[model samples]
Target chain A: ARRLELGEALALGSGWRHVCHALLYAPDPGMLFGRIPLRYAILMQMRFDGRLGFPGGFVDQDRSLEDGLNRELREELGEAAAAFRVERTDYRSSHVPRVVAHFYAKRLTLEELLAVEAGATRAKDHGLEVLGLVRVPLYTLRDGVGGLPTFLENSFIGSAREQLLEALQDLGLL
Target chain B: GARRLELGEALALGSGWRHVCHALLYAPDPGMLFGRIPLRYAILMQMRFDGRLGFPGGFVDTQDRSLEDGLNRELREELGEAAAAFRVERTDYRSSHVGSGPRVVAHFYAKRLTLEELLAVEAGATRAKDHGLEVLGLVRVPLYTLRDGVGGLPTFLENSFIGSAREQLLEALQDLGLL
Candidate 1:
């Protein structure tokens, strides 16, 4: 029911699958909703199924999580995905089930972040697996409804919504 | 910010604004995914060009005879000729709104179809004129939420939506007891 650390999660079972996903983000130095200052530009993708979630997928049991995640990233974000690395040290937490979700985070420069978004459609699985890249709207408008709060009410896949919330809180972006 | 208005209230306040129509199509699931979890019901939604999820259909022009007529035309344009059979009328209307950017009065309708016809509509949408342009692709809403309250409908709701389309969907689901 709660997120677990790597070792704790792995101990749940050896036969369990390892699903890896990452949070890629950068600082936002712009205005939003007329005058509200933009805070951060967090990355998420609109999957072909229309659910929003972080990039990456199930890790190859034969490979390390970082290696497998990097592989998934390249497939989903194009060659530009290789521009930054998500290390084992960047591992955050894990959610358990028949599959254990291992989450990671990486900070990219705003320009680099945009490059990933721009080049995503060029990826092999672009139109087939992922529909498009979307930036998380990090600000709440004056009405306390239109920005991130409203965006949060939309659908996400797996524990992505929770993973997003935790990352923002831990990064002090919320 | 946008305001939610009754269908009549919205109609009265909109002389110089845009009027849009969309629909929610759902049916009981006749099959399962992975032969494990029951799909329960299939709720149809679409991925907009901007990557947000919303219903099918578009803005109604003045030349359009009526809202329903305009809606049917819009559906034909976006979902191909097969959509002609799945008509959405005024009685099926569930909500209306005036909102965020370029004065739009959006009307939403909900219709139920057999699982078979629903699958046909999904298939026919791929050949639509607006496919990959205005309409990215079709996506079925996952009606069931996980035990952790994360994935499924809750997580799907965490994604972006166009205008008040999300509210319209939730309302329809509630009214139809599919929520």
Candidate 2:
């Protein structure tokens, strides 16, 4: 009886929208100074609006969040989206307000990740909505101000910047 | 005789170099902002396919009438028809170098655009054939750094830039009295 009451209360709760986004990454596979191995290749998009953000959009009421996220992935990543299988288990954390933003991080083989980069150029939304793909520079440069630290200062849409930072920490890329 | 000798030496060395050209497009702006801070200039740059930042350009061909003509053709191919209304001239040329690589001479130009013209180029860029594949997107260089010292130009300078674009950007800003 208590469970039923809670379920009914949640259904009548305040109106909230669900949006999803994901971070696609892979082991960098490249060495920096012939000794140091660069750690990860995290993909972020240069959006048409001049802001940096991950690939995602609003979830439809009819489909599960994962299905909706994959739908957006297919549109933004093109054939490369086929290589991704973002599972419910991949969900990380949520940033909430009037919108509940669910973020995920998916790991891919370096080759598969590179293929997605190439495949993006052929996507239908390529030049229109998605500007291009940028791999995050996960290290600090010799000058002490370049690379990841500098990248983090660039403008990002919504809670994406925080999401990126948390994912890097969670994955130990930081 | 010494002058003639120097000219002969210059011509001999020039024969070994391949020339590439690029441009820096900018305008005085009163209304752009980063949060609440106002930006004084709108300097254009682009995200390249290799994920490095650079200006639009390519190696010039021998058949091209002039460097400007070659650069204009390049802009048309990468930025679309709206670029046809703008022209870059010999007077607009800024600097050059012969040391980026073996036989590579890099020529750079700075063009002043009206703010409206700049927006037009940014808009038309999306329809260009090279839009997604070669050119990533048009980006404006932030002229002012935030109070933290790393929020703007300093951090932006840290991004990967192709060839001498970083130097070219600074040099143009200095020359134009914008920095």
Candidate 3:
């Protein structure tokens, strides 16, 4: 009936809601978004939830991590997904810390870039969860340092904005 | 103090204070609580952040760790970091951790282990704090006692719990036919 104090060396198991986000990029030398530099065009999306997010979803417990991530990519990107490969798991979260957000980056060829762009207006044509695709211009702010702070002010689901910006810095795409 | 700031920035499960997860681990047994009757299973529980009865697991953070990774990490802490001898049966995300107190999203689960494994932790030599700082001692809730109805809850809803942990435990017990 009384609560017992335990030995000081215990570790608690944490439960988290797991999800994945991918930063799809393509080399853009022609300066696609006017003032932005000739870096890769980032492929983000307007979620059906109407929030800005990456092309990913809840991971399956039964599947391998790579397979789970690939499943989400195939569902979100459809035919264009064939050209891209999830290169690395760039970043994960530690704050509020319940949701496991895995951020990944993939390199897409120039041809693959336009196809994603063509489908970007509203990829509801390809995927239901996505309402529209938003390619974040991979250029640094002219007056500011190299950090892409401009993206932080837009609509985002959670720490996705922070994760994306951090990924850009790590990848040198900023 | 800084933990709160980090907690807020990490992301709330919803619009809650934080997200918490709990697991109702059961060990099958033919013996009953106090030897009252035959028993199928007994749920493992320990003290909560508050003094009430709660499950073996606690809040989870991805912190880049996989679900199993986080679960094992948390359990090792709770199990006093001597977790080489156990296996996690299956994990399930049940419901939101809700109520009048601090808001949270909670994950509920059921784990199975051998009687010897349970004995090792209870051997009184396994020196581990519940997840570094939550549980005091691990105890099995008697299935027969809980079957006595809400009357058997022992002023449970009145005090000594960590938010919705009370309801979360109740649901798991009922769902698994333990109640």
Candidate 4:
């Protein structure tokens, strides 16, 4: 039931709790502007701290899961940023104690990502640090190359990668 | 917590150990009195053979037969041919309560049998030589007692089945602007 600020959202806390979080994904066009005409964002993190993660935060008990995520996104990204539209949700047990985390997927426009003030402010203020904001080299990530983003090893993000891939194929993108 | 009272009966079990089927007849009256309080009525009949309070019907042998058919058959067995004229207006699954290690699923049917029809059925039962049942009696329940503000009603009957029955009765009364 606690409201978490962006920095607090990233801090690993302990407790037997039922907590909900969200995952925001944006398609990076640099990878498939010509070959398949499809874009994708690699589930990765930046050099600032050596880890891959999503843009999301803890859910408030007073609000529905969807509304909480939307509120968090607005607080971090501001009102003019493209509205983060939720796509799906998945539940899993977090490595930290009795916390069961509900992870949700949200879609955003590339324009919203560009609106982010680069180097002017710390990325943690946005609930995530954008270390190397680059198109996920899909071939490297999926082909099982070492030195890939930490999202590949993250139990939650890894599952989302597979889900997003399958969804794209179902939409005839692959 | 609801008070649990034990009532003994011979529960007929099938080959698969499924307890027999039964139907409950609920006569909803907007004018019934629960003590000094006004409320709706939900009258249940007690079968004499088992000396247990239950609905008015018995088991359905074949799944092909509509539930209504089995209900009418059980009614006829206890009340005789005149019971056939009773009109069943609504049917719903009440609940499955497990007591004394036996499972009983009750299906409830809201019925309307005019006072005259009910009298005729009672008279036919009295004259029949083979009928073994004794009209044990009926009780009226008050809906207002169920509200928290008033003296609360008994909790033993505040289950999904009884709650649903009460809800349906309230809806009917509301439609008639009687509430």
Ten-residue stretch with the least lDDT total in model 2 chain B: B1-10
lDDT of 3 by residue, A63-104 (tens): 544567767776676655755666444433322345555566
Q: After superposition, which runs of candidate 2 have C-alpha atoms over 4 Å from their true positions? A: A1-174, B1-16
lDDT of 3: 0.52
Q: What's the DockQ of model 3? A: 0.01
| TM-scores, all models, native as reference | 0.58, 0.57, 0.40, 0.30
Flag the better candidate by TM-score, 1 or 2: 1
Expressed as tens digits, the lDDT of each residue in B62-178 for candidate 2 is: 777777888888888777777887898888887766535677667788999997787677657766766544565566776766676665667567667777888888878888964
Residue pairs with backbone atoms closer than 3 Å in model 4 (clashes):
A45-A52, A46-A131
Cα deviation at A150, candidate 2, in Å, is 14
Give a tens-digit lDDT track for model 4, residues A106-127: 4555554434322212223321
Model 2 lDDT per residue over A17-62, tens place: 7678999988876754454355887788866455678998887753
Q: Is candidate 1 or candidate 2 better by DockQ?
A: 1
- Candidate 4, residue A100: CA error in Å? 1.8
Error of 4 at B38 (Å): 73
Best candidate (score: DockQ)? 1
Question: Compared with the real two-chain complex, what DockQ does model 2 have?
Answer: 0.08
lDDT score of residue A153 within candidate 3: 47
**lDDT score of residue B165 within candidate 4:** 41
lDDT of 1 by residue, A15-40 (tens): 78888999988886765423656577
DockQ class, candidate 4: incorrect
TM-score of chain B of each: 0.91, 0.88, 0.67, 0.49
